[PDB]
Design an enzyme around this catalytic site. Structure first.
Site, PDB file in Angstrom:
ATOM      1  N   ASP A   8     -18.845 -13.279  -4.619  1.00  0.00           N
ATOM      2  CA  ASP A   8     -18.108 -12.033  -4.689  1.00  0.00           C
ATOM      3  C   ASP A   8     -18.865 -11.151  -5.689  1.00  0.00           C
ATOM      4  O   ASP A   8     -18.791 -11.357  -6.904  1.00  0.00           O
ATOM      5  CB  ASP A   8     -16.670 -12.318  -5.163  1.00  0.00           C
ATOM      6  N   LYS A  69     -22.288  -0.953  -7.789  1.00  0.00           N
ATOM      7  CA  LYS A  69     -21.675  -1.043  -6.457  1.00  0.00           C
ATOM      8  C   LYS A  69     -21.239   0.332  -5.915  1.00  0.00           C
ATOM      9  O   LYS A  69     -21.218   0.533  -4.685  1.00  0.00           O
ATOM     10  CB  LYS A  69     -20.491  -2.016  -6.485  1.00  0.00           C
ATOM     11  N   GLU A 173     -14.602  -8.458   2.172  1.00  0.00           N
ATOM     12  CA  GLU A 173     -13.756  -9.058   1.124  1.00  0.00           C
ATOM     13  C   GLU A 173     -12.364  -9.529   1.620  1.00  0.00           C
ATOM     14  O   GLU A 173     -11.982 -10.696   1.368  1.00  0.00           O
ATOM     15  CB  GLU A 173     -13.658  -8.117  -0.079  1.00  0.00           C
ATOM     16  N   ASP A 197      -5.268  -5.676  -2.685  1.00  0.00           N
ATOM     17  CA  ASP A 197      -6.401  -6.025  -3.556  1.00  0.00           C
ATOM     18  C   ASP A 197      -6.597  -5.038  -4.708  1.00  0.00           C
ATOM     19  O   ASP A 197      -7.132  -3.929  -4.550  1.00  0.00           O
ATOM     20  CB  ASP A 197      -7.674  -6.137  -2.700  1.00  0.00           C
TER      21      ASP A 197
END
Ligand SMILES: [Cl-]
Ligand code: NA
Length: 382
Positions: A8, A69, A173, A197
């Site tokens: 991850d 990211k 994800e 999430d």
């Protein structure tokens, strides 16, 4: 090819797992932590990655890089890049249409594409896996947000290649989290799964449909600039005001003091997911003045009440987009440490009229968990 791992690669922190002897093992790093900050820093003498980087940010803000990211797979001209760079202390520059982070390292100006920064984090994850397993790690599944496009996916693959990994697959994800809970092992009619999430810096709601082990992303919603750090910040401002009352000093412009308070607030947040009181304990916070205080869960909740309630709006939007009634969700999966917050879980369950949540896997680990499962399947080990 030893065992393959699941990684991850997170916006604020990353996590690596391995499937071994019928179980997933989440691997602690060289600091004993089961997650690693997605941070890199450069000093007069070295390059720091993970906790070391995060831990000196206030001392070295312009040469400490995070949020790669947010840039990965982007072009300089992108509206997201232009907006985001306004809130980073490090430089982002245009290299012929592609963004680079620019820092000082050993007194020299150096710059790195986003995937080069992310490659350093992947290298860290590879190394911690190798230290744990005592053998070479080459094969990995690496996860990405469901909303990632081709450019973002390819740049992520590039980060892996740079780090010496054979990327077996880029997996979404939410899909990884569903795989963790074995939701694709159910045999029968279509099932609708909502992944809720709430990470350190982003909030993603995804709806998947699963049938015969086959995943389809039906809808995505959220806020790319809402996460646990926002809740920490509410506590930070609360304590700055408290320090001002008690000690008649405003610490707001002292970056080191604010940073140490922020770290304490982050710890307090975690503490309050399990207990009703947490302490703030800081020796010599400001001008040698100690700050020992505490806070209740209730007060933490009050400070954040609007933000917590606000998490249901993307849930409503995602259901709308998927053309589903809330009653049509078979499974709700929690991802991200902030989903441990009792008030959040209560708000969510109340929204779903009492429905219970999939939360038995540590929410910060569920993505790496599912990635590890799929890596073992894809490498022929499960
Ligand atoms: Cl994160
Ligand atoms: Na995440």
């Amino acid at each position: 090819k030893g065992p393959a791992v699941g990684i991850d690669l997170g916006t604020t922190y990353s996590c690596v797992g391995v499937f071994q002897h019928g179980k997933v093992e989440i691997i602690a790093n060289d600091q004993g932590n089961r997650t690693t900050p997605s941070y890199v820093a450069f000093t007069d003498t070295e390059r720091l990655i993970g906790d070391a980087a995060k831990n000196q940010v206030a001392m070295n803000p312009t040469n400490t890089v995070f949020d790669a990211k947010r840039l990965i797979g982007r072009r300089f001209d992108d509206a997201v890049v232009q907006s985001d760079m306004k809130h980073w202390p490090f430089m982002v520059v245009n290299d012929a249409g592609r963004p680079k982070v620019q820092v000082e390292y050993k007194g020299e100006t150096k710059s790195f594409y986003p995937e080069e920064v992310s490659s350093m984090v992947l290298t860290k994850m590879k190394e911690i896996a190798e230290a744990y397993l005592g053998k070479t790690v080459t094969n990995a599944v690496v996860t990405v947000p469901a909303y990632f496009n081709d450019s973002q996916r390819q740049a992520t693959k590039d980060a892996g290649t740079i780090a010496g990994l054979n990327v077996l697959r880029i997996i979404n994800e939410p899909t990884a989290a569903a795989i963790a809970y074995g939701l694709d092992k159910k045999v029968g009619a279509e099932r609708n799964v909502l992944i809720f999430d709430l990470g350190g810096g982003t909030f993603d709601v995804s709806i998947l449909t699963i049938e015969d082990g086959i995943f389809e992303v039906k809808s995505t919603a959220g806020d790319t600039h809402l996460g646990g750090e926002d809740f920490d910040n509410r506590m930070v401002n609360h304590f700055i005001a408290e320090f001002k009352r008690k000690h008649k000093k405003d610490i707001s412009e002292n970056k080191r003091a604010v940073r140490r308070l922020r770290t304490a607030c982050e710890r307090a947040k975690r503490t309050l997911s399990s207990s009703t009181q947490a302490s703030i304990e800081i020796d010599s916070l400001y001008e040698g003045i100690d700050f020992y205080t505490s806070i209740t869960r209730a007060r933490f909740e009050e400070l954040n009440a609007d933000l917590f309630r606000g998490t249901l709006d993307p849930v409503e939007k995602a259901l709308r987009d998927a053309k589903l009634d809330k009653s049509q969700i078979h499974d709700i999966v929690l991802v991200g440490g902030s989903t441990r917050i009792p008030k959040i879980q209560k708000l969510l369950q109340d929204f779903f009229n009492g429905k219970e949540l999939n939360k038995s896997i540590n929410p910060d680990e569920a993505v790496a968990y599912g990635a590890a499962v799929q890596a073992a399947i894809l490498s022929g080990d499960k």
